[PDB]
Curated annotation (Swiss-Prot):
GO biological process, one term: nucleotide-excision repair
UniProt source species: Thermotoga maritima (strain ATCC 43589 / DSM 3109 / JCM 10099 / NBRC 100826 / MSB8)
Gene Ontology CC entries for this record: cytoplasm; excinuclease repair complex
Function text: The UvrABC repair system catalyzes the recognition and processing of DNA lesions. UvrC both incises the 5' and 3' sides of the lesion. The N-terminal half is responsible for the 3' incision and the C-terminal half is responsible for the 5' incision.
Predominant localisation class: cytoplasm
Family (UniProt): Belongs to the UvrC family.
Residues of the full protein shown: 340 to 557 of 557
Protein name: UvrABC system protein C
Top-level division of the source organism's lineage: Bacteria
């Protein structure tokens, strides 16, 4: 279910865009403490996700610095790729102006729009725009935000699924680390292990007795 053409036209009007927002690129900045910030970039082409074109950028740093992270990704990405019709940033006035300053710095020009993180406030050209809750343009920006969040969050469902599975396996009395790891590597997640027969789980670890305790905990 895409961004409605009518709402895209209303966005164009709200932002005083010359061109229709045919290509919209959206950025989320998320930080892993003591490791790096991951920027996730989504792409909409006439209101539908263009999943092949989705990208991430990593900024190595122990502590977050979201405005610097945005500045870095704008510069890295748009020194190689063409500008879209519109850039969306998951954040407020600070994150938007960071994107704009970075674009100036590389001699490029593209409209940038944000939605403030807490409220559903639209941010554009150093101003907040407070639309009514049901306003079509707000609903459209929330959709972009929801997809940008979904893609950001997928950066490790795998390692999170495995951690979640382990968390549950830790409640199985007397399984021990080696068999625990065997189950995690074979199944990968709770969804998979919960789909499995007693006989499969028992084959993975070499013990039906323990496999029964696994099923008990699930
Ligand atoms: Mn169309
Ligand atoms: Mn988010």
């Amino acid at each position: 279910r895409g961004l409605r053409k009518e709402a895209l036209e209303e966005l164009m009007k709200l932002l005083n865009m010359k061109d229709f927002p045919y290509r919209i690129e959206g950025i989320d900045i998320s930080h892993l403490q003591g490791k790096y910030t991951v920027a996730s970039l989504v792409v909409f082409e006439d209101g539908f996700p263009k999943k092949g074109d989705y990208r991430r950028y990593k900024i190595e740093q122990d502590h977050p610095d979201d405005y610097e992270s945005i500045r870095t990704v704008v510069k890295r990405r748009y020194s190689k790729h063409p500008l879209p019709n519109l850039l969306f940033v998951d954040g407020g006035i600070g994150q938007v102006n960071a994107a704009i300053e970075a674009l100036k710095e590389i001699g490029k020009d593209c409209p940038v729009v944000g939605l403030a993180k807490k409220e559903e406030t639209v941010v554009f050209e150093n101003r907040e725009i407070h639309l009514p809750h049901d306003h079509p343009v707000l609903r459209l920006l929330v959709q972009i935000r929801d997809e940008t969040h979904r893609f950001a969050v997928s950066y490790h469902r795998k390692r999170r699924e495995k951690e979640s599975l382990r968390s549950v396996l830790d409640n199985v009395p007397g399984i021990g680390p080696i068999r625990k790891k065997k189950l995690i590597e074979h199944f990968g997640s709770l969804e998979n292990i919960r789909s499995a027969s007693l006989e499969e789980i028992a084959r993975v670890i070499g013990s039906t007795e323990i496999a029964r305790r696994v099923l008990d905990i699930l």
